[PDB]
């Protein structure tokens, strides 16, 4: 109970490629996920966002 991590606030970017290009070049039509992680030390006291 000295260190805590809370990944929070899910966020989405723009699709890496349009549909037809993905279907032609065999790419999976996806988009990245970005999440604000936060690490906190209890004893000294910080947040690492």
């Amino acid at each position: 109970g000295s260190m805590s991590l809370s990944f929070s606030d899910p966020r989405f970017d723009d699709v890496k490629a349009p549909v037809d290009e993905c279907k032609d070049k065999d790419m999976t039509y996806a988009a990245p996920l970005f999440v604000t992680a936060e690490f906190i030390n209890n004893n000294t006291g910080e947040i690492k966002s």
């Binding site: 000294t44 006291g45 910080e46 947040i47 690492k48 966002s49």
Partner: protein
């Protein structure tokens, strides 16, 4: 501490404070300071009370330059014969974050590899420590990383 001071923080080098935060916890208004670096793009909030405990430092002085220069020009340095003990030792030197210890590490590693070349693990050992040391001097004398690379190479040959 004031706003705008280019303050140094281990292991992440120098950083810019952005404001003195009054973010309360448990009804007690700690004077946090938000402090961001350029490499990791992360912002760190530290109380000014234990700021020296966590170890927010200021830029190394000019005499520090000639100090680690004397350490880098220091002769007589030898190491344990078994390279495993040697490595773990200078790995702890780099991990300690002590500029002096780090300097010993890089200089002796290069003294070994300038002789006959060394292992890829030791090459990466040299590379990381050289990068962080070059950054440190390039913000200490504001000499720039490329120029700090050139001067680090200058002083290795002696």
């Amino acid at each position: 501490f004031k706003v705008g001071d280019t303050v140094v923080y281990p292991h992440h080098g120098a950083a810019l404070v952005e404001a003195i935060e009054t973010r309360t916890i448990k009804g007690e208004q700690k004077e946090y300071l938000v402090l961001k670096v350029a490499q990791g793009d992360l912002t760190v909030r530290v109380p000014a009370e234990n700021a020296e405990y966590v170890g927010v430092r200021d830029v190394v002085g000019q005499e520090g330059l000639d100090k680690v220069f004397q350490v880098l020009r220091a002769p007589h340095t030898e190491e344990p014969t078994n390279w495993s003990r040697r490595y773990k030792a200078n790995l702890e030197k780099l991990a300690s974050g002590d500029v002096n210890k780090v300097a010993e590490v890089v200089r002796d590693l290069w003294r070994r590899d300038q002789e006959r070349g060394l292992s890829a693990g030791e090459k990466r050992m040299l590379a990381k420590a050289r990068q962080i040391l070059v950054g440190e001097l390039a913000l200490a004398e504001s000499t720039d990383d490329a120029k700090a690379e050139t001067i680090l190479d200058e002083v290795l040959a002696a």
